[PDB]
Symmetry: C5
Subunit: 103 residues, 5 copies
Amino acid sequence: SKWVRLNVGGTYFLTTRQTLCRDPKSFLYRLCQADPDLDSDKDETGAYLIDRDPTYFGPVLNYLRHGKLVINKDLAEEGVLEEAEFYNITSLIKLVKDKIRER
Amino acid sequence: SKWVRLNVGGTYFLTTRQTLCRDPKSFLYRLCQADPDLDSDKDETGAYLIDRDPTYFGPVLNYLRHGKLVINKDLAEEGVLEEAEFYNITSLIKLVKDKIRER
Amino acid sequence: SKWVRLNVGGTYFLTTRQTLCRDPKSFLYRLCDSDKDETGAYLIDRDPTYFGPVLNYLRHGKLVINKDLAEEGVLEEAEFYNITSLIKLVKDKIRER
Amino acid sequence: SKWVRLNVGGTYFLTTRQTLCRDPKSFLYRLCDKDETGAYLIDRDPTYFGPVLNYLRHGKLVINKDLAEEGVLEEAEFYNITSLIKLVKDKIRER
Amino acid sequence: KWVRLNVGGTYFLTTRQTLCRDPKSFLYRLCQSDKDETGAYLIDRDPTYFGPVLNYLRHGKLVINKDLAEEGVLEEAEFYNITSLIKLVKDKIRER
């Protein structure tokens, strides 16, 4: 299964293992690996259930896709930070913290 | 049932009982207790029905998830305050009112 | 049931009869079948982004509008739904923007 | 059928024949290709459609602060609503 | 004629004519790849930045809302290899 569906707080995201496997130290890596104890946290669509805000997930997932932090002006950088911390993407945590500092 | 679906004013949110139990004094706490007389207040999908604005609920649920108050630049703090007061999350009410005051 | 579903311009809102019963002179008070869809939602040929602040006003009596939402859009809707007290509130926000 | 559903770029809008039969020169009139729900399919951006449909509803151009006027203009031109096109060009010209 | 795209979990409905606009693009193969059960082509990219890419294929203009990061649209224009769009976005960014 190249494709992986995530239900982040009620909103569906579609991605791949090429993307989710990019940071071995991230929570998302357990999804990359199809960690058997996450099996029960899937909904009827087979999507992994994640109890986080989907609006701040976009920039996190995009960072895994192309290595750039891109955040629209109408999205609080602080929200993305909280998500980068939760998913434990340390290079992204640093980028967001730096961005917040440059203000 | 670790996972709980809420239908807040027509928009679905997915979260866990743990997150909704975080403040035992709040409106939300009765859900995570599975309180009897919420039965007629669920829809066909099993979601608990709530007659409140889903857009202002975002920051409320996010506060329950990570303890930070995060509000995007275009979102009226007053909206979030009304919801925090409606759900009766006292530490959140304080955070929002502090946010408003520094304005 | 107490619960009432509205399809406003294609976007679904969920509310209760108690909320829609607020203003007996409003359009929405009639909701307090030819104009319902298969889900049982009442059909309304209006913009759903301007409806938010209207329905919230019915919920908690306050006028709350986000910084990017056009207040003129909300004014149109308040007049459309004929919520006299809300119309006034919006005419105020605009007087002194 | 009083009620008409439009699938604009994958996003559904609900409106009435009354609203769509407003300007007989418009693309939308020309329909007052459906998906399995009976919605008329339109290959255009739904995010810029709001102001167009609303203009048909109540004759006013209302564009939220976020939305690029140029996006609304492209739509007004595509749907061929000439008085709306004029209103949008005005808004752009006066920046 | 109609083509459905599942971009990062969000569906877009368009047409072969639109997706055919630039034969050199990644999208050109879809206007003649995995699909989900709905018949939509699966694309592992951000749907928010897709909007202006697809709009450009529809009417040839770069249209970017004020709050949308141009850099987001640039990444997508590059990913889909729409060379004329890549130039427009870069140009827009330079003129900042």
